[model samples]
Target chain A: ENTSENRAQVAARQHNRKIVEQYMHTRGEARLKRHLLFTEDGVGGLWTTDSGQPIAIRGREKLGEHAVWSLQCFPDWVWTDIQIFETQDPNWFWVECRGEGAIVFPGYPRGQYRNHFLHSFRFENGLIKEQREFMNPCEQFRSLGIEVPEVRRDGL
Target chain B: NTSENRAQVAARQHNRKIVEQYMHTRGEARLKRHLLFTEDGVGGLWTTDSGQPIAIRGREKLGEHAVWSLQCFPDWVWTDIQIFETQDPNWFWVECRGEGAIVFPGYPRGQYRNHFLHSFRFENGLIKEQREFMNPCEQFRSLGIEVPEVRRDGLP
Candidate 1:
């Protein structure tokens, strides 16, 4: 049942999983630098709510920019208990993890929040060309006893 | 340099193929009949009368959910289904979108949709457990539905 092609795909997926783990576990500025895993023109987007708008992060530079603000607010942000799922397509994979961190926004009271996240990645030439994130921001906010916003947004 | 064992890889591939075919098989009734174990199967997402998310269990409850959902949206169809295989051969994840026109009373007409993430666990090559995830609040908002308090304490 283990054909040569299947073996090769498994190996490639293992490599992709390692890259995703490295990108997710690294913290703050160091994590931002891990953009090398993505192609120069890779795009990213986050859906805070299922039916709401998505916050897009286009290009390598913009990707780093988004992380800067996130790290500033949650200096110790990290995704834990990661479980990467490999797909039939060699260039695609999925990451399911628990995102945990303490929010220290300027004026807002500091609080810790943990929420589930699903991240899908698409690759080109062995580098990620697109990354999409999905999570429930309302659940994350409610964890900290914060009032749900008038509009569901990806603030967290 | 690290890699999964050949036997483990083959088993995972076998399970992944089963789930892949499950998603590709058209029609809700056919898909459910083909994949799920008819006797002791479980899982469904719906707001309870008390406005809390409740889990429906057993084949009976699952069938009831299917009927209820179809009643809510006569043309309900799940599309863009994607499968992700995990390290374990028994577990897989599905990311898909369900769309249809709202025909049931107490809701607006036209089209509506929601994104879903489902964990499908297999037992002896048949689906034994199914857990569904989605932003229920977002899905209900536009439809003028209310779940008075959205709390995590519901459905353990």
Candidate 2:
């Protein structure tokens, strides 16, 4: 007969696994839309401090209805053929994808490489409290031989 | 007949529970040891870009051994507790236990106010690469700490 301890262990493991899987899936989709495929929503935030403070902003707007309009106006390429690799925990994972479609910038050719590293921290209750993402634009630029502006002056 | 059927069903469920629990616990333990507490051992090697091998000796003998030893050894009471907080494939993911700690020869015992970042990369199923470390030498030197010479002639 299985002991109560055994049952508890199984439950905890199952819980952890589910959390990790969900985390990886969410991040993979996000990376695909934004970085790989150059979607407008790909611009995001990176939390710098362990205290869960959002320090860096990648996309254009800060808040409110204007942000929504800004996003709509900016067309971007859509990412396709996404792949996720090895999740260490609910909060940590890596993903790579190919940006094969154009979205906002139709003139720009497709088939770009996008790579991302995502990290998240969860509270004791298993709620994600912080997330940080580092994107590699250098590799994509090198592959495509395209120079993206160092600064995005336009609102979009 | 009822008793036999009930017993068979219960046994099957019980066995499943036990196996699940065993696998979960084993996996957790393995992950903790490998990811959290494991320290990589680095040694000096002699090689050439042309696939030629040569014997390496002398000052290179010390190489990165001292660095790794300092980074991992003596179990700094203050810096012992670290919580990994990254999902990046090649980034340092760690959290401090309690204010963090470091010890240098001449400095007064004090807690490390900031968390230490240790970036690592893996290869062939092992941590084959690492870069950058918290430089404690400056703090030691500021406090008049001197590194003792171990070699007989003080050459290496």
Best by TM-score: 1
The digit string of per-residue lDDT tens for model 1 on A77-98 reads: 8888887877667778888888
lDDT string for model 2 (B5-121, tens) is 676555444433432332233212422322321144232211111112222122222243334324322233224434332233333333222232444443454444422333333
Question: How big a share of the true inter-chain contacts is recovered in candidate 1?
Answer: 0.14
Q: Which regions of candidate 2 are displaced past 4 Å?
A: A1-6, A27-45, A49-118, A123-126, A134-156, B1-93, B96-116, B119-156
Worst lDDT window (10 residues) for model 1 chain A?
A147-156
RMSD of 1: 7.5
Pairs of colliding residues, candidate 1 = none
TM-score on alpha carbons, each prediction:
0.75, 0.32
Off by over 4 Å in 1: A1-11, A104-109, A143-156, B1-35, B46-53, B85-87, B103-110, B145-156
* Model 1 docking category: incorrect
DockQ of each: 0.18, 0.03
